[PDB]
């Protein structure tokens, strides 16, 4: 029967930013996760509730794929119970997370010698973000007392900071594309069961 759209997220040209992480709904598909192993050796293929080699033998109720790019050294923040700029302000994973994390280097695609400024990570936020939330607001952050009237000033700046990815940057500041596969394990009416 129908195959899965995994080719739309792994064989894509560009990924979304961290503050605007795109969620891809997967349903009514036979997920052959072997198509992911043939990709470049991932810096991190870590499943927190199952083993990556057992996915093809299980059924999943609702599986969603999240995509975004980070500076590499932040991959340690994409995991349950982590803290930091990303984990707190852009993408938060719950402590009860049941899924797999996939991260690989993209210094060839998402980096330029002049600097690619199309990726942002929302440096600052007023409150810490909750699991599976998205704050695409680009309003000015009021750090001082004076109400910021929409113009950057000595006490209110813009929250979105841009990455300056360049091939000359060493490992740790390079772009690492992260794919988070979240699926429910309980035996509810399934929509993705794999190749039998």
């Amino acid at each position, epitope marked *: 029967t129908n195959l899965c759209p995994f080719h739309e997220v792994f064989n894509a*040209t560009t990924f979304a930013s961290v503050y605007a992480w795109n969620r891809k709904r997967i349903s009514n598909c036979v997920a052959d996760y072997s198509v992911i192993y043939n990709f470049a050796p991932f810096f991190a293929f870590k499943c927190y509730g199952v083993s990556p080699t057992k996915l093809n033998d299980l059924c999943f109720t609702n599986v969603y794929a999240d*995509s975004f790019v980070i500076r590499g050294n932040e991959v340690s923040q994409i995991a349950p119970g982590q803290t930091g700029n990303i984990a707190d302000y852009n993408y938060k994973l719950p402590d009860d997370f049941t899924g797999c994390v996939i991260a690989w280097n993209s210094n060839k695609l998402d980096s*330029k010698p*002049s600097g690619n400024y199309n990726y942002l990570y929302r440096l600052l936020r007023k409150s810490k973000l909750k699991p599976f939330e998205r704050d695409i607001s680009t309003e000015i952050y009021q750090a001082g007392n004076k109400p910021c009237n929409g113009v950057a000033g000595p006490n209110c700046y813009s929250p979105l900071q841009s990455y300056g990815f360049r091939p000359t940057y060493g490992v740790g500041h390079q772009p690492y594309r992260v794919v988070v596969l979240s699926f429910e394990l309980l035996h509810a009416p399934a929509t993705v069961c794999g190749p039998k």
Partner: antibody
Amino acid sequence: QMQLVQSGAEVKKPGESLKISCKGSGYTFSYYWIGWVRQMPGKGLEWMGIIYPGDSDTRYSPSFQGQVTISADKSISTAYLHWSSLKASDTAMYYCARQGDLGDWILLGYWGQGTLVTVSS
Amino acid sequence: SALTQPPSASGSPGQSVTISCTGASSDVGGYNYVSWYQQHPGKAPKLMIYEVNKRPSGVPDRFSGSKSGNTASLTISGLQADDEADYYCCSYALSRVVFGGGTMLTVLG
């Protein structure tokens, strides 16, 4: 100044090897994707593949997987396109392109003069 | 997928014309991975439009682009004799560029 210069016109016969080149200067020939494009007489453009001169990572189009190979000599800043056992259908204009400082990584903002390849018995 | 374009288009000087492109695919990042190239007879193409809401420098503002669903449009405001060329659309979403059959732009008069 940035410019791409390609080998001259090549006239061959079927069953013969060919290796055209396209040399780039005025920019770093290690961080830009270089590729080749086919345009047959009166037909449109056909994309064959790209490569990363830094580390040789070749991305071929499904219609040109084993029919042609792409390589680069990072030391002399030149990209190549190698054929084996040419066919009468391979006669066409072959361009080289590279991504520009703007856009995505396969946008192909800069092009070459174009290399004319003709093969006839 | 493969893109489709009209075999030819026609327009008189001063008027405007539009070129349609159907078949543009998409990925997770977004939808508009659309670009347009101009090729005069006897020389290599040139990037006219990329990221249809954008265009490179050195290109007159007469060239505009848009997208409504899987249909992309190339709008030329003022026509001139030096506009006759083959215009191709390119979809580069799934790490694969697909060029359309192209359309011949011939100016009347």
